[PDB]
Design a protein around this ligand. Structure first.
Ligand SMILES: [Cl-]
Ligand SMILES: [Cl-]
Ligand SMILES: [Cl-]
Ligand SMILES: [Cl-]
Ligand SMILES: [Cl-]
Ligand SMILES: [Cl-]
Length: 252
């Protein structure tokens, strides 16, 4: 069974930051597990930055720490095998639990299911936008700007959607698709929300259906049942995995 589980995500989501703010946090676990928490914190900064230096990336309007975003990020991907850093994180939370007690989320803490659904809808909005764009192989002419990180993200998403055969087999990824999806992502990577990104992209492209498509995303949840709920969980896992591979390659 691929990890991480909802229980594992819960312990890390609500107490990993509070556990790291304790002096003897690593005194409970081993060296190989320190090295696992090491890379997890490294990638959290490489993807989302700091609480004071936040990078522009997906899940920007969720009000989550970089560790909380990354934990939700891996749970949606749901491909942690035997080399997962989560048991090291759980044992870190366990040691904090032995010292300062069990931490219960306060009434103004992030809601876990909303944190999952927010990142899950962000991933579906980007993919469903790239899907709507590829349905038109001719759009108002634009060129991809010179130095935009959203170019690498947008290109990888469009190429991945061709591999999924969600777009009609035969179409071409034109520079208009790369540029207009990058405009959606640049807005989405702010705190503007999916609707503000869909409407702004629909203004530029003229794709009228682009707004209602993102609206149907908001009618979905990462906990839906049946083949439909699993099909959306697969899309969100793929899109987030596509953006993850790019962001980790450009950071090296
Ligand atoms: Cl689970
Ligand atoms: Cl931080
Ligand atoms: Cl949301
Ligand atoms: Cl067309
Ligand atoms: Cl292929
Ligand atoms: Cl913007």
């Amino acid at each position: 069974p691929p990890g991480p589980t909802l229980r594992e995500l819960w312990w890390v989501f609500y107490a990993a930051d509070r556990a790291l703010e304790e002096p003897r946090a690593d005194s409970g676990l081993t060296r190989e597990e320190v090295r696992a928490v090491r890379g997890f914190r490294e990638q959290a900064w490489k993807l989302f930055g700091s609480a004071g230096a936040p990078r522009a990336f997906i899940g920007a309007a969720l009000g989550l720490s970089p560790l909380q975003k990354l934990a939700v990020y891996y749970y949606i991907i749901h491909r942690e095998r035997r080399l997962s850093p989560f048991p090291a994180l759980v044992r870190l939370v366990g040691r904090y639990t032995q010292r300062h007690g069990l931490y219960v989320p306060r009434p103004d803490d992030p809601v876990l299911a909303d944190a999952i659904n927010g990142l899950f809808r962000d991933a579906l909005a980007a993919g469903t936008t790239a899907e709507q764009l590829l349905m038109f192989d001719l759009l108002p002419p634009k060129d991809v700007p010179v130095g935009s990180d959203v170019q690498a993200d947008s290109t990888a998403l469009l190429r991945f959607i061709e591999s999924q055969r969600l777009a009609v087999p035969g179409g071409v990824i034109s520079p208009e698709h790369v540029a207009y999806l990058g405009a959606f992502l640049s807005v989405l990577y702010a705190g503007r929300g999916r609707m503000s990104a869909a409407t702004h992209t629909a203004r530029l492209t003229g794709v009228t259906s682009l707004v209602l498509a993102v609206g149907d995303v908001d009618r979905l949840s990462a906990f839906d049942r049946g083949a439909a709920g699993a099909a959306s969980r697969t899309r969100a896992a793929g899109y987030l995995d596509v953006l993850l591979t790019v962001r980790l390659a450009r950071s090296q």
